[PDB]
């Protein structure tokens, strides 16, 4: 029969919003799913969401016929700088479909053969970094993730070269990006945004906005002018043309294509790393096991694209970093007609549901009651998981277009590491979890002894 589902406590007209202002709202909203279960209703002055975290619940979701991608109030605010790339638009604008049949064949596994080189550019650059450190110098891993995430995006992205590993201070692009995310994720608990205080912020964000389009348009004309043919993606956008409208993209689509790779690489793919070495470094037994793999396959000093997917339980390492703590934690969706989610709770058209993917991922009736372990070889058997147990790279045609991407960077960089350094949690890092459009492990330190295997 219908349910009534829970409700987290309330602030008088404010309903359930003050329980996001906080520097951890996800964290808090898997407080608040450990404590009601599966299904809980969110309200907020002017709207109201759904938030799941059961396999049970999720599956249901997860049918295409039944919802399509919402923008959650998240990627509307990004929307104001990443426009209508792949990330931000809805399934139902024409730029959607359009850059969607251009650029999937650019991001399959077969194209990442034509990355590999220039991921193993940065991976050696962050080899190399790492075995100049002197003796008892550390390693700030989430910071040296992301100068290798987003210079290895920009080079196969734009053939664009943030040099990252050459500064302290990120190029003036990347502060604006940064900016314009801290901006659009400050704005979900800022209660009166047109208050003259916000002036500076609006002053702000409409400046990064500028610094993120003068620099990409600039780079977009540079290469028509010079007809130049690169491995990048850029080249695919500008000489692609959609099947099904015969259409290209126009360069301002190009544009914010190319702002929403940036934003990708910058905040997921280092999470992932940053999170798969946390891991590693807590669970000695898994380490070795993963080091043993990255000796007996990365036989050669560069790495290669088929040795690379032999890397198999650095795969099953990184899956199971994502299960833990899956960097992008939310989806939004709505109800594209009247339905009854589970049996229970009936939703009407436009109705919302916001996808839990931490707690998804921690529901024991899939994973057993070993959930909050770190154990690589429960990803051995995956034909045994359950339909959209796993969901780090989101669902269906609105899936991660970049997981192909993302898997193939981290696992050479991954396998790189393990091969050429020990690694020592010479702080006993307590992780704490920062939150911008991602999660990421703040403060995160190591030592590395290198193996003095060169390159
Ligand atoms: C260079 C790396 C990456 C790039 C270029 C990339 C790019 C994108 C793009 C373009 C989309 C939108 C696809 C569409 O709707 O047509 C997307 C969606 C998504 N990506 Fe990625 N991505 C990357 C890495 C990652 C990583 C590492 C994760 C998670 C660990 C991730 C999680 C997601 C999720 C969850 C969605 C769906 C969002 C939603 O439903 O609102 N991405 N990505
Ligand atoms: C890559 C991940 C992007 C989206 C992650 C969502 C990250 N939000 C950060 C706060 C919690 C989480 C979320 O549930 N927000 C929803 C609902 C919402 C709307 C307005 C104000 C507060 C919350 C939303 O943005 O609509």
């Known amino acids: 029969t219908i349910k009534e589902m829970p409700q987290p406590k309330t602030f008088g007209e404010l309903k359930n919003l003050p329980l996001l202002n906080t520097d951890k709202p996800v964290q808090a909203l898997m407080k608040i799913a450990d404590e009601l279960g ?8 002017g709207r109201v969401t759904r938030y799941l975290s059961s396999q049970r619940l ?8 039944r919802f399509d991608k919402n923008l959650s109030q998240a990627l509307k605010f990004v929307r104001d700088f990443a426009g ?3 990330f931000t638009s809805w399934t139902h604008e024409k730029n959607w479909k359009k850059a969607h049949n251009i650029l999937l064949p650019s991001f399959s596994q077969q194209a990442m053969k034509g990355y590999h080189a220039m991921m193993v550019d940065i991976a050696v650059q962050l080899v190399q970094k790492w075995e100049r450190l002197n003796a008892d110098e550390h390693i700030e891993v989430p910071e040296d993730m992301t100068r290798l995430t987003l210079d290895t995006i920009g080079l196969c992205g734009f053939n664009y070269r943030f040099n990252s590993f050459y500064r302290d201070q990120p190029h003036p692009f990347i502060t604006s990006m940064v900016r314009a995310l801290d901006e659009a994720m400050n704005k ?11 002036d500076e912020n609006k002053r702000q964000f409409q400046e990064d906005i500028k610094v993120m389009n003068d620099l990409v348009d ?3 004309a540079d290469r028509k002018a010079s007809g130049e043919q690169s491995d990048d993606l850029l080249t695919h956008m500008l000489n692609g043309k959609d099947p099904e409208t015969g259409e290209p993209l126009d360069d301002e689509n190009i544009r914010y294509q190319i702002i929403t790779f940036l934003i990708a690489g910058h905040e997921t793919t280092s999470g992932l790393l940053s999170f798969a070495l946390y891991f590693l470094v807590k669970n000695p037994h898994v380490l070795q096991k993963a080091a043993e793999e990255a000796a007996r396959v990365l036989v050669d000093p560069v790495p290669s694209y088929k040795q690379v997917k032999q890397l198999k339980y650095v795969g099953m390492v990184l899956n ?48 057993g009651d070993d959930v909050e372990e770190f154990r690589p070889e429960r990803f051995e058997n995956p034909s045994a998981i359950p339909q959209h147990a796993f969901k780090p790279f989101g669902n269906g ?14 696992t050479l960089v991954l396998g790189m590491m393990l091969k050429h350094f020990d690694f020592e949690d010479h702080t006993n890092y307590e992780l704490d979890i920062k939150e911008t459009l991602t999660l990421k492990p703040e403060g995160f330190v190591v030592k590395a002894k290198s193996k003095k295997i060169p390159l």
Not at 38 to 45: R, T, V
């Open 397 to 410: 045609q609105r899936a991660c277009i970049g997981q192909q991407f993302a898997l193939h960077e981290a």
């Open 218 to 220: 600039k780079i977009i």
């Open 58 to 65: 999720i599956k249901e979701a997860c049918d295409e016929s």
């Open 38 to 45: 599966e299904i809980f209703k969110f309200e907020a002055p």
């Open 188 to 198: 979900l608990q800022r209660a009166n945004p047109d208050d003259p205080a916000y």
């Open 84 to 86: 209508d790339g792949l």
């Open 320 to 367: 199971e970093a994502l299960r833990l703590w899956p960097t992008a934690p939310a989806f939004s969706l709505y109800a594209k007609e009247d339905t009854v989610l589970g049996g229970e709770y009936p939703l009407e058209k436009g109705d919302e549901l916001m996808v839990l993917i931490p707690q998804l991922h921690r529901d024991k009736t899939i994973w």
